Structure formats: C-alpha cells, structure tokens
Structure 1
Amino acid sequence: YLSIVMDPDELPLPYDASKWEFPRDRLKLGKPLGRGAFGQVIEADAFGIDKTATCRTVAVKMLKEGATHSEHRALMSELKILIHIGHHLNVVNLLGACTKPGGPLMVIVEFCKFGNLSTYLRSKRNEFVPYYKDFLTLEHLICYSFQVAKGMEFLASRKCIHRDLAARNILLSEKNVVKICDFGLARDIYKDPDYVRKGDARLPLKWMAPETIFDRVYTIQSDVWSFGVLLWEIFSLGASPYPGVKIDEEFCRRLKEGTRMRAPDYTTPEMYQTMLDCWHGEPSQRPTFSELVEHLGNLLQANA
C-alpha cells in the first residue's frame, strides 16, 4: 500500500548502496510511531546517519508479523521512489536504508517530533489566537498551508502524485516546518474511519475528487482537490471533513452536483475562497500547485 507514486500520465530505479545503505548495528529501535496490519513506523536512534559521529532520532518503516513477500517488494519500491524524488524541505527526507540479507528491510527518514498535523492541530484548540507563547496563530496556519503547497509542487516536478493527501499524512517538526509523508503500510486503513469500504478497496472518500470517486482517475489536479480538503482541515484546527454527514452514494451524488463544505471556524475569507477554487468540479479549472504556492505566498506576507 503506497499512495505516493509515479504519475501514470507522465510515463514512461537503481539502488546506490554506497550512498544509502546504513548498518543495522548503528540503529537502535525504539517505540512505535504508527502501526498498520503489515507494517509500522518506529522511532529510533541512528548513530552518524547524516552527521559524522552524532546520534540522530529517526523514523523507520519496516514490516511486521502478517506481512508477506509482496509487502516486502512494496516497501522496496517505496524506498526506490523516495530516492527518485530526492530532497525538499517539505517532504519527509530519506536518510538511509537497511537492505542486507539476514534482517528486515528498513526505510529510514527524518523524525518529525510533533507527529501528524491533524492530531497536533486538534490538540491546540485551547491554545490558538488569530493574531501566549506557544499559542498557534493564523500566521502558522497560512504558513503550514503554504509549505504543503510547495512540497506538492515539488512532488509534481518529480512527476509523482500523492494518492492520499490529507492532514494525517502531513508531519510537523521543529521550527514550524511541515513535511508531506505517507504512513502507507504503517496505517491500519481497515480500522481507520477515514477510509471507507468501496469494492475490495478502502478509500479516503472525503478527500477524493469526484472524478476519482466516480471514474477512478488520479491526477495531480485531483491532488489539488485533496489539498483543498487539507486546507479545510488546517483551518478547522484538525476537524473531520463533512461534519456529521454519512459518506454514502448520496454524498458522492451531491458532491458531483456541486455541494461543498461550509467555511471552517478559523478560516479567513481568502482561504475559504481558495478551498472553493480547489474544489472546482472541473479539474482543469482548479488552480495548479504553482498557482497555489504563489497565492498562499501572497496571503502569508499580506497577513503579517
């Protein structure tokens, strides 16, 4: 289960072990940060992984009991696409991997100390003011929004899409930097109500563009729709989308016909209009991530 993938619309991966391979004995595994059926992300201390002679807290994805060879192959392709994507401030950064025989495949990325953005924002409801040290403000929210737009613009430039863009897949680290990730195998989607059963699949319906729901099309522009939902999540401080609405056939029907969420509690007028732009019924009429980067950039400096 991987949602970050090469864009099929853009098609038509080696492994440089001398670069990426990290000795398992320089890694000390710690507590779980997330668990799915067949995979998990665990906190760990990596000695010298990115700076000579320095201990570094990292996150490591690996398989668990119940996984089979096909999950193993899938994790390997996750490693390979992370290598292809390369470095950007706003995408969780690959630091190394353990791929030698005799032990588990392990994919090592930077640790983001505040966890996923949805949970985090939902914990700051009592510590927010629009304009008190450690209180969140409108500036933070706009800034997080701007950052994710940049990461997504970057992913687009690497010819990838994110099939599961949502606040639960945004991480907050120090210095108010947010990073796009995908828990993937390390999330239990059969147990997480954000994923709704449909066919043999469990899908993030509330984040999905109508053409994705009805036609099963995944494009970068369907990602823009999800980004609109993510914006709504940010400016609701971590609320669940479409509050108190049964996600069924009629939901999808009303969505295709043009029903949208009302403005969240902490939004500005400009931001809500931006959400609405992202939720344009016509994919080609939605803004691009580049246009969003520019626009959120202006909203940011305008705000301060």
Structure 2
Amino acid sequence: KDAWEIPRESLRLEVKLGQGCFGEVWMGTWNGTTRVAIKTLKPGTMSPEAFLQEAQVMKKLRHEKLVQLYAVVSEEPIYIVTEYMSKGSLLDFLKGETGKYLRLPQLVDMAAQIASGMAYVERMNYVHRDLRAANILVGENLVCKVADFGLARLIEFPIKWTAPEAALYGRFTIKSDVWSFGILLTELTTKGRVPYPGMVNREVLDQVERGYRMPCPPECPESLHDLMCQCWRKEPEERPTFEYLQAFLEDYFT
C-alpha cells in the first residue's frame, strides 16, 4: 500500500460514461467536492496486480497533457481515480456533431497537444503502446489528454495502429508510438474514420510490409501527409521524435 490510497467511502460513483472489457468507467465525486472519473476492475477479466500496473505508471507519469491520477483504492473492486474530461474520447467527439464543424487549425492544435504529452513520455523513457484516437480524452476548451497506460512500459494488439516491427517482432520503442501517432493523424484529419478501410488484420500487415501507406486524406494538406509519412517510415530510426513533431505542429500555421 502507499500514499495514493483513499477511503472507498469518499467516492460517490454516479454516471457510467463507458466501459471496457477490463472493468468500466464512471463519473463521480471525491470527498463530495471533487468531480472525478473512476475506472473499476470487474472481478473477472484480470488479476488486480495487473489493473494496478496502469496506476503505478501514472504515479510516475505526471504531465498536463496526460490524464491526471488523483487516487487509488487497491482493495478489489479496484478503483482508479483521475481527473474528469468533460467531452470523453476524441474518437467519439470527432465522429460526433461537434466534431463535424472542426477546422484544420483546431485539429492540428489538438494534435499538437497529444504530441506534447508524448514528448514527455518520450523524454521519460516510456512507451505507451496503445496510441489511437480512442485513447485521447477531450476536456473543456478542446484540451486533449492522453489516457490508457495499461500497456505503458518503461523501455527496459490494435494492429492497424501498431508499427510493423512492433506488431511482428515485439520491438516496442517510442518510435513504434510515433508510428501509432501518424495513424492517429489520419483519424483527426478524417473526422474519426477507420484506418485502412476495407482491410482486415493480416491484410493490413502484409500491405504495410510491402510498403503500402495510406494516401493523403482528402481535405488533408500534403505537408501534413508528409508528416504522417515520416511517422510511418519503415526504419524506426528514420521516424521523427515527438519533441520535433510537437515543435512542428505548433509552428504549423506560420
């Protein structure tokens, strides 16, 4: 146990925002005053030690562009308490009505933020491994935080987002995340459309290995598509660093 623990009695779960195979996500209050989001462990899906691995990472990962860990209740049902993001996953937001009026600059701005969070994880020597629009949370003011560190591992699957070397040989490095990001970029620029349309798992992989890359989205500026191509380079070392991506994305409209 440790200093991140809080009494279960201090939390009032209220609305169920969504749910994953490994638990669920509820909106609630902490000590009556703080409105939070709690991720619970359904007694079946997996071992409590594992559900907690995610929180541990968050105990060490603290950045304004990463969802913030508030507290934990490691007594099963395990609760993981974090800040609350008013708009939910970026994916839904995009596929939603408010997302349809979003313009290039707003989109790039959001990309810039995600990149900022990732620039942190990068210099912190961790690898997220599950980077896609579904794992980004939109708070108030089109602010985006990065969630889901269930696969976050310090450098000692959703195939359509996973870099080939990682999907194939297990080489997960921050570079395979850069790959995932370029894919995320297509989601932003396509208003949440699915990567590699009409393609199945094995097919996607075979295509990418044969050098196939997604074409520049319509409505999407080549320069941005070029950026996506740097992310998708076959050579992990030829892929950009998040620090760069970030600087670049911020400077975009200039």
Q: Tell me the distance in 2 between the aligned counterparts of 1:138 and 1:154.
A: 24
Match of 1:60 in 2: 38
2:31 pairs, out of 47, 51, 65, with 47
CA distance in 1: counterparts of 2:114 and 2:99, whole angstroms: 24
1:294 match:
247
- Post-superposition offset of 1:183: 7.7
Is 1:275 aligned with 2:207?
A: no
What is the alpha-carbon distance in structure 2 between the residues aligned to residue 170 and residue 108 of structure 1? 17
Q: 1:206 to 1:59 in 2, by over 3 A?
A: same
Q: Distance in 1 between matches of 2:208 and 2:19?
A: 32
Residue 70 of structure 2 corresponds to: 95
Alignment match, 1:4: none
| 2:115 paired residue number | 149
For the pair 1:204 / 2:177, whether they are aligned, the reply is no
Q: 1: distance between equivalents of 2:71 and 2:7?
A: 9
Are the equivalent residues in 2 in contact too, given 1:113–1:173 (CA < 8 A)? yes
2:209 corresponds in structure 1 to 256
Match of 1:77 among 45, 48, 53: 53
RMSD: 2.0
- Partners of 1:74 and 1:266 in 2: CA distance: 42
The AA in structure 2 aligned to 1:90 is K
Of 247, 270, 280, the residue aligned with 2:201 is: 247
Tell me how many residue pairs correspond in the alignment. Answer: 249
SS of corresponding position for 2:191: coil
Contact 2:160 2:204 in 1 (8 A): no
For normalisation by structure 1, the TM-score amounts to: 0.77
Find the counterpart in structure 1 of residue 178 from structure 2. 224
Closer/same/farther in 2, CA of residues 281 and 159 from structure 1, 3 Å limit: same
In structure 2, the CA distance between the partners of 1:125 and 1:206, relative to structure 1 (3 Å rule), is farther
Aligned position for 1:171: 137
Instruction: Pick the aligned partner of 2:94 from 109, 121, 126.
Output: 121
Q: 1:57 to 1:265 in 2, by over 3 A?
A: farther
Identity of aligned residues (%): 37
Alpha-carbon distance, 1:177 to partner: 0.7
The structure-2 alpha-carbon separation of the partners of 1:226 and 1:85, relative to structure 1 and needing over 3 Å to count, comes to same
Counterpart of 2:154 in structure 1 is: none
Query: Cα deviation per residue 1:83-141 (whole Å; 9 max; x = unaligned)?
Result: 0112x111000011223x5x63211001111110111101137742xxxxxxx221110
Q: Could you give the per-residue CA deviations for residues 212-244 of structure 1, whole angstroms, max 9, x where no partner exists?
A: 122121110010000000011100011000112
Is the CA contact (8 Å cut-off) linking 2:40 and 2:77 kept in structure 1? yes
CA–CA separation in structure 2 for the residues paired with 1:251 and 1:28: 44
Match of 1:132 in 2: none
Counterpart of 1:160 in structure 2 is: 126
- Corresponding position of 1:215: 169
SS in 1 for 2:160: helix
Give 1:37 deviation, angstroms. Answer: 3.2
Rounded Cα–Cα distance in structure 1 between residues aligned with 2:121 and 2:215: 29
Rg larger in 1 or in 2? 1
| 8 Å Cα contact 1:91-1:151 kept in structure 2 | yes
Gaps in structure 2 of 5+ consecutive residues: 152-156
In structure 2, distance between residues paired with 1:66 and 1:126: 36
2-structure distance, mates of 1:124, 1:36:
24
Determine the C-alpha separation between the residues in 1 that align with 2:50 and 2:241. Answer: 30
In the alignment, what sits opposite 1:140? 106
Give the counterpart letter for 2:134 in structure 1.
Answer: R
Q: Distance in 2 between matches of 1:267 and 1:275?
A: 11
